[PDB]
Amino acid sequence: ITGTSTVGVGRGVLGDQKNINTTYSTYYYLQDNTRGNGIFTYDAKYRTTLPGSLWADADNQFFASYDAPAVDAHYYAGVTYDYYKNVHNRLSYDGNNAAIRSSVHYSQGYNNAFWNGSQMVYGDGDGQTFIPLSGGIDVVAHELTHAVTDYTAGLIYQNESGAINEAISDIFGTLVEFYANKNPDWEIGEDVYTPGISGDSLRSMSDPAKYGDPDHYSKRYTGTQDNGGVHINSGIINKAAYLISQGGTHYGVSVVGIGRDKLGKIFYRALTQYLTPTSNFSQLRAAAVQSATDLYGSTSQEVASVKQAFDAVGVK
Template structure:
């Protein structure tokens, strides 16, 4: 049954549509679960529990159930133990006891006082690759929504056994990407190469033990490889370079000759680009690679005075200034402390390589090329590009959207949207660093730069490097246009809160466009009520979703 579509009905109204792996459960007084392929039904009656009417229930709320459609069953305490007991009590819906198949990886409390418990499914104790389940609890300790990916029909055991060590898996991964450990340089990147044992889903709904291998280096070119290696045979099941980028794209003097204020520090008789001014203690540090592609992050940018005015320092001035502003935006708007919300250092390296036409988030820092002068000028000169890259870091630490197909397009779109929130003077992305065309992308008119703006024009591109991993930089135009529709209807202040909540609370690695729509509608309802939720819904309806 794992390949069937499932409809969930409450009071004869369909509120959930999902395919293999996805689920959401609302436990009202009567809940019917109908499997579309077989029309089998299951009805659960919970005596003594009343569920309120829900006039706003919509069929296209694909992944989220309003809390008044759920059992108002107060948890004795808000804890992992209490939630797992709750799931155990509702085992008929989940086919057994899902608490035995979930491992808590994070829990947060948002500004509304709602609590969100993020779990990873496990098979025989091994985490499932690219799957998460989030359980949401309101201020009254009621579970009001559950979303994510859980295969109820999965075997309790994997279809293979582990015969390879982590080091052997790394060897297979290096061979798969056509490199050797000796041929690449990590510099002093904080996160070294690693191999983690996971349970990887197969097309037949089973799981195989596999190593999730991460290989990062910056020479001879930036790379953030994720390679899946079968733990028994060594076969490479999947490989992807997940470098995420803006596209094929004191005081200091910026690239445009503007003088700006910089937060710096004094060290060993000189001034350096280390911002220690943030109230949380988070450091923002800017380095110069001096056109090298090795020894990341490079040389700390310094000056004998508190002024950074030389031509070679201008790219660093922009990077340092812009990143400070982007940090302030996330902290002041969402109380988010750095990309990881743990005060992690935020590092930039400018002058990467020679005429490098890109800016990139490489897993734990940003790099900026100088451009070739024909397509791009130095890429640190754009506020929205800096915000775009920083948002990739935020996404990595929250929803962790897979960088392929629709999740990858959402990954790019959310970065573009927060790029706009940091630079609201226009709807374009990258307009300050493009030479051969006005900008890279447009939220208001994606077709201007070759992107679709409606789901009917979605492009089914190959999930390969040549195919942009399913068109992540192409199909992002569809959710970008939905964001434009949302912002013009309800304004920036509400929209940015809704988008941040959806990204950090509801989305999961495999979320689709429909999942994003549902997450944004639910976030709008959480924060502002039904009227703004309807506006978000209309914004996505307008792009065919």
């Protein structure tokens, strides 16, 4: 909408106070004009029609329980925008400052979040499996990264390309979480998963097997569930990424870590310059090696470590 840029204040899903960029025109809307062509947050009102209504508030204060998922969807979209712009010189998901749209309060007791081809969508959770999913910065960044992937490599959402797609979203979800630097880790969704159980998460990049996901190509899933295991086989690539960044010895193969920033540069370049819609794991290895070669040189430690990491997870 047309209006003037304002700054509201509210509380997120975890009870933390934050400022948010709003727009005033009769109401205060969750419309942040400070980033690209805007970040817009909508109320789906427990229904499934999208996007719903642009979030309107009378007083620019967002402290109601009902407000919390909107505050976080809006704020964490801003953090994710900032990560891509400041770290990778990418302007929004399409590289041309496309408006970023999110809807919260999607459906009833909805234990998921997704990119629907055009916007981000967040359930509230059922209160047991999940609390409102926009409370997780890694979740918000995971979702926006699906848009980045779709506009770039275009990895088809099934089988190995789909597992790469998923891992890309977990990798950048995590790198955004580290960028914001509040309780960062290499787990996925820990801030919103199972409020009654401490110390768990949906997936682990550092040890995928802790939640039953494969950490080696010989353990890949080849059945039909989950689009051919896109959230399962992502563990193989997540583990490779974790090893590239942090190092370790895995099934007897030692990897020299090169740190998060270089992991991000290598994978961002692979995603945007080398991967294609049908890339498989072997082709991802080749894309990562080439990306590291471009950035650091063929004789570099960075190239050597990429090779070691893919060796460790059984991908040649």
